[PDB]
Amino acid sequence: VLSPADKTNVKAAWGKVGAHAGEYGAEALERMFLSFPTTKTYFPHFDLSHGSAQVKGHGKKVADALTNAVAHVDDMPNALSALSDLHAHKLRVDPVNFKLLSHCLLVTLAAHLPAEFTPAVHASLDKFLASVSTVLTSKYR
Amino acid sequence: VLSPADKTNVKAAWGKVGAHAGEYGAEALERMFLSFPTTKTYFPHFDLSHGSAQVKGHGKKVADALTNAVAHVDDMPNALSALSDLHAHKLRVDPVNFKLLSHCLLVTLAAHLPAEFTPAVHASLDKFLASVSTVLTSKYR
Amino acid sequence: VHLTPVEKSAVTALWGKVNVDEVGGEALGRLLVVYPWTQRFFESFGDLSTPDAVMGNPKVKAHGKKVLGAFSDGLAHLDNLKGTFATLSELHCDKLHVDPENFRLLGNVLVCVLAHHFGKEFTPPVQAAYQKVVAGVANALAHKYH
Amino acid sequence: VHLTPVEKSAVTALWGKVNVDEVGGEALGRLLVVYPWTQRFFESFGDLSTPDAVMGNPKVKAHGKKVLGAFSDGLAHLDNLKGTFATLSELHCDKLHVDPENFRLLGNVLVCVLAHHFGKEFTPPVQAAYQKVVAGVANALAHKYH
Ligand code: HEM
Ligand code: HEM
Ligand code: HEM
Ligand code: HEM
């Protein structure tokens, strides 16, 4: 789990993203598809091109699913139940992919918020994503 | 995160071990040092021989640390806070060692309780040990 | 892999006593129940809703026999594992694109089935020998990645 | 690793703009802060109680320079990474016995430091060119493991 200081360091880092959630979430998604092309096989119904309003439209829902996860962090299994029903139960996503997106999500935030990306916040954000990943990769019916 | 079904499965399977906690925990500990000789480097103040009342005495504390963890499951970061201060804070253990011991713990019970080791219970036990491994490797100060 | 003769004899003796039908199917069957994300690769298999349905699936049972056979061929060539699974590597790596951790997971789930099957007879030194075998099979199956 | 001419040129130019003093130490330091357990291999370094202390550690800053130098040597030999890091593999695997997952983690933390330093300049395909390099350096540093 996460330290109380981690719960704060995510809230104040993600609370510096702004309405830039989709832009960042789109960058994260684009960085993943480009760097690790196997993650593309999860989206055959997707236009995986540059600028794609589908990918830029996913990164919104994705970066907004991550927002309610930052809200009620100490209630992650209950709050992400529909997302877990999708990822764990329906999609059956390999957790390595979750590590790939989590990494790209950190490269994005480091590219865009260099001041909010302190060695301590990197750690907190990585712990947070690891936890979101755990809740989304597990079947807790 | 564990399914409510998993929490019961672990209680009924680990609740079939009996006073053989120290025996199993010893075997798991032994199987680990034997199969993965690197886990030995964490115990230089130990007699890592067969039969050794130290290793057989460690497997007691270990399998007993696992017993209170199964008790108050839905409180595992609060419960194992001293163990976390040890494994995570003091000893600084690479979580691979935790995947390894967890593997050995599954082999031990597989060998000793073959009936209680259904594919459903294996999954439940692998999720529990993974959850315990997380807690012990994480600094939630 | 290079293991000591006592361990090399111990694995062959243990493997000789193995059930060459329902072990591989139990190994591939527990892979899908414990690691659900791997069911995604076996869509051409049908009905994997309950563990009782994953194990009790003729497709899983039959495919597992060929998986166990790959391991049997692997125990025969511990000098050259990398060449025995060279075409199997090409299949899982370059054509199926299965993440290599899953190879460690099936190898370790075989070790969990053997412990189940043999009980007291799968002693700590027999596991240590088998861990060397499944690691080398996982190293050979993930060769077209390094 | 084999990469396309455009990507080979894009990494050389980005690396050609790297801070050869404070990047490797930021890469090595962040490893110790994000993945604490790694501090256990660096007891001969002293004081790593706070991130500020881990980064503001002259030993970490010094060693990290020799790590970035190993990476700079790897970008020079992308045809034979396996032989450039063979002796380095012998060191980390056969003598230091470091778990190879931590080689994936250091390389992925170098990618986070270049993202931190270059910003918009560290574009998605530049990263994609660097992810190929760090994984290859991680496949070459974990060579005496397969
Ligand atoms: C940081 C973790 C992630 C979050 C927060 C997340 C969130 C979401 C959300 C919100 C949806 C769309 C459903 C909706 O409208 O709410 C979704 C769909 C999906 N996710 Fe994730 N996801 C994450 C990571 C991943 C990863 C790493 C993969 C696989 C590489 C993945 C694959 C998919 C796929 C294939 C869909 C299809 C559904 C659709 O077409 O919208 N997700 N995800
Ligand atoms: C199921 C996993 C684990 C549990 C429940 C656990 C539990 C324990 C317990 C209860 C102690 C002794 C302190 C006490 O309570 O009196 C301990 C100590 C220790 N553990 Fe673990 N441990 C686990 C896994 C590991 C692993 C995988 C390693 C590393 C290979 C590890 C390394 C150590 C070491 C080196 C000590 C030193 C302290 C002593 O000598 O007792 N532990 N562990
Ligand atoms: C390291 C252990 C493994 C061995 C020795 C192995 C061996 C094999 C062999 C021999 C085949 C059959 C080739 C034929 O049909 O002629 C096969 C097929 C296949 N393997 Fe593996 N495999 C292993 C692990 C995996 C893993 C970890 C996965 C994925 C979770 C996987 C997925 C598949 C799939 C999808 C097929 C084709 C079956 C279909 O039609 O869906 N294998 N494997
Ligand atoms: C993949 C990136 C890595 C590279 C290129 C690398 C490179 C190096 C180099 C060049 C040295 C210096 C050897 C000398 O002094 O002659 C070294 C030493 C060392 N490396 Fe690495 N290394 C890597 C990853 C790791 C990791 C992941 C760890 C540990 C978590 C590690 C732990 C060490 C330690 C402990 C030393 C000796 C310093 C000491 O404690 O006295 N290395 N490494």
Short mmCIF file of N, CA and C in Angstrom, two decimals, chain C residues 84-138:
data_model
loop_
_atom_site.label_atom_id
_atom_site.label_comp_id
_atom_site.label_asym_id
_atom_site.label_seq_id
_atom_site.Cartn_x
_atom_site.Cartn_y
_atom_site.Cartn_z
N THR C 84 16.52 -26.86 -28.93
CA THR C 84 15.36 -27.76 -28.95
C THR C 84 14.08 -26.91 -29.04
N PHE C 85 14.09 -25.80 -28.32
CA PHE C 85 12.97 -24.88 -28.26
C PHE C 85 13.16 -23.66 -29.15
N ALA C 86 14.11 -23.73 -30.09
CA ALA C 86 14.41 -22.63 -31.02
C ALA C 86 13.24 -22.28 -31.94
N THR C 87 12.52 -23.32 -32.37
CA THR C 87 11.35 -23.19 -33.25
C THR C 87 10.08 -22.87 -32.44
N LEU C 88 10.10 -23.30 -31.17
CA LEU C 88 9.01 -23.07 -30.22
C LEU C 88 9.10 -21.63 -29.70
N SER C 89 10.34 -21.13 -29.65
CA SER C 89 10.66 -19.77 -29.23
C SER C 89 10.08 -18.88 -30.30
N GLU C 90 10.45 -19.16 -31.55
CA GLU C 90 9.96 -18.44 -32.74
C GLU C 90 8.43 -18.34 -32.75
N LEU C 91 7.77 -19.43 -32.34
CA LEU C 91 6.31 -19.51 -32.28
C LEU C 91 5.69 -18.61 -31.21
N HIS C 92 6.18 -18.75 -29.97
CA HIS C 92 5.67 -17.97 -28.84
C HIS C 92 6.14 -16.52 -28.79
N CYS C 93 7.33 -16.27 -29.31
CA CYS C 93 7.92 -14.94 -29.31
C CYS C 93 7.63 -14.07 -30.52
N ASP C 94 8.02 -14.55 -31.70
CA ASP C 94 7.85 -13.81 -32.95
C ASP C 94 6.47 -13.90 -33.61
N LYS C 95 5.68 -14.92 -33.25
CA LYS C 95 4.36 -15.07 -33.85
C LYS C 95 3.18 -14.97 -32.89
N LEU C 96 3.35 -15.44 -31.66
CA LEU C 96 2.27 -15.36 -30.66
C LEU C 96 2.42 -14.16 -29.72
N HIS C 97 3.65 -13.63 -29.64
CA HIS C 97 4.02 -12.47 -28.81
C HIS C 97 3.53 -12.51 -27.35
N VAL C 98 3.73 -13.67 -26.72
CA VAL C 98 3.37 -13.92 -25.32
C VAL C 98 4.48 -13.34 -24.46
N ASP C 99 4.10 -12.53 -23.46
CA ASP C 99 5.06 -11.90 -22.54
C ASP C 99 5.80 -13.02 -21.80
N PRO C 100 7.12 -13.05 -21.83
CA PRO C 100 8.03 -14.03 -21.25
C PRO C 100 7.90 -14.35 -19.73
N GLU C 101 7.19 -13.53 -18.94
CA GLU C 101 7.03 -13.82 -17.51
C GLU C 101 6.11 -15.02 -17.40
N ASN C 102 5.18 -15.12 -18.34
CA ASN C 102 4.23 -16.21 -18.39
C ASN C 102 4.93 -17.56 -18.59
N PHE C 103 6.14 -17.56 -19.14
CA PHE C 103 6.90 -18.81 -19.34
C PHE C 103 7.45 -19.27 -18.00
N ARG C 104 7.78 -18.29 -17.14
CA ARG C 104 8.27 -18.56 -15.79
C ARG C 104 7.09 -19.06 -14.98
N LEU C 105 5.92 -18.51 -15.26
CA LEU C 105 4.70 -18.89 -14.56
C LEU C 105 4.18 -20.29 -14.85
N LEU C 106 4.34 -20.78 -16.08
CA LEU C 106 3.88 -22.13 -16.45
C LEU C 106 4.88 -23.14 -15.93
N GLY C 107 6.15 -22.76 -15.98
CA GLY C 107 7.21 -23.62 -15.48
C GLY C 107 7.06 -23.83 -13.99
N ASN C 108 6.70 -22.77 -13.27
CA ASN C 108 6.51 -22.82 -11.83
C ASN C 108 5.20 -23.49 -11.42
N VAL C 109 4.24 -23.49 -12.34
CA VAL C 109 2.94 -24.13 -12.11
C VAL C 109 3.05 -25.65 -12.39
N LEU C 110 4.12 -26.06 -13.08
CA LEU C 110 4.37 -27.48 -13.36
C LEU C 110 4.94 -28.04 -12.07
N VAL C 111 5.86 -27.28 -11.47
CA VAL C 111 6.51 -27.59 -10.20
C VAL C 111 5.45 -27.73 -9.07
N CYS C 112 4.36 -26.96 -9.18
CA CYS C 112 3.24 -26.97 -8.23
C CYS C 112 2.29 -28.14 -8.45
N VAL C 113 2.33 -28.71 -9.66
CA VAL C 113 1.49 -29.86 -10.03
C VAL C 113 2.24 -31.14 -9.64
N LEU C 114 3.57 -31.11 -9.76
CA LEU C 114 4.42 -32.24 -9.41
C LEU C 114 4.43 -32.43 -7.91
N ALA C 115 4.40 -31.32 -7.17
CA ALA C 115 4.36 -31.34 -5.72
C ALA C 115 3.04 -31.89 -5.26
N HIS C 116 2.02 -31.65 -6.08
CA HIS C 116 0.66 -32.09 -5.81
C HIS C 116 0.57 -33.60 -6.01
N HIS C 117 1.13 -34.04 -7.13
CA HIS C 117 1.12 -35.44 -7.54
C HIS C 117 1.99 -36.40 -6.75
N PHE C 118 3.19 -35.95 -6.40
CA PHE C 118 4.15 -36.77 -5.69
C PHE C 118 4.23 -36.63 -4.19
N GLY C 119 3.70 -35.54 -3.65
CA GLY C 119 3.70 -35.30 -2.22
C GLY C 119 5.07 -35.29 -1.58
N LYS C 120 5.25 -36.22 -0.64
CA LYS C 120 6.48 -36.43 0.13
C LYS C 120 7.67 -36.75 -0.78
N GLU C 121 7.38 -37.36 -1.93
CA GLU C 121 8.38 -37.76 -2.93
C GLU C 121 8.99 -36.57 -3.72
N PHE C 122 8.38 -35.38 -3.61
CA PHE C 122 8.90 -34.16 -4.26
C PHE C 122 9.56 -33.38 -3.12
N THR C 123 10.71 -33.90 -2.71
CA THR C 123 11.53 -33.39 -1.62
C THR C 123 12.22 -32.07 -2.02
N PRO C 124 12.72 -31.26 -1.05
CA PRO C 124 13.39 -30.01 -1.44
C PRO C 124 14.51 -30.16 -2.49
N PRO C 125 15.38 -31.23 -2.41
CA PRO C 125 16.42 -31.33 -3.44
C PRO C 125 15.93 -31.69 -4.85
N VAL C 126 14.72 -32.26 -4.96
CA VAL C 126 14.10 -32.65 -6.25
C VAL C 126 13.49 -31.41 -6.92
N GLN C 127 13.02 -30.48 -6.09
CA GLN C 127 12.45 -29.21 -6.54
C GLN C 127 13.58 -28.38 -7.13
N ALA C 128 14.70 -28.31 -6.41
CA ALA C 128 15.88 -27.56 -6.81
C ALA C 128 16.41 -27.97 -8.16
N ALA C 129 16.25 -29.25 -8.46
CA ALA C 129 16.69 -29.79 -9.73
C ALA C 129 15.69 -29.36 -10.80
N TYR C 130 14.40 -29.49 -10.49
CA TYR C 130 13.32 -29.12 -11.41
C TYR C 130 13.23 -27.62 -11.70
N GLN C 131 13.67 -26.81 -10.73
CA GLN C 131 13.65 -25.35 -10.87
C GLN C 131 14.70 -24.93 -11.89
N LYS C 132 15.76 -25.73 -11.97
CA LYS C 132 16.85 -25.53 -12.92
C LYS C 132 16.35 -25.90 -14.32
N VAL C 133 15.48 -26.91 -14.39
CA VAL C 133 14.92 -27.38 -15.66
C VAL C 133 13.90 -26.40 -16.25
N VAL C 134 12.94 -25.96 -15.43
CA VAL C 134 11.89 -25.04 -15.86
C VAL C 134 12.38 -23.61 -16.15
N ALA C 135 13.53 -23.25 -15.56
CA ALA C 135 14.15 -21.94 -15.76
C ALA C 135 14.82 -21.94 -17.12
N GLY C 136 15.52 -23.04 -17.40
CA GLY C 136 16.22 -23.23 -18.67
C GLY C 136 15.28 -23.42 -19.84
N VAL C 137 14.08 -23.93 -19.56
CA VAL C 137 13.04 -24.14 -20.58
C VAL C 137 12.37 -22.78 -20.81
N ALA C 138 12.35 -21.95 -19.76
CA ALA C 138 11.78 -20.60 -19.83
C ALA C 138 12.79 -19.64 -20.44
#
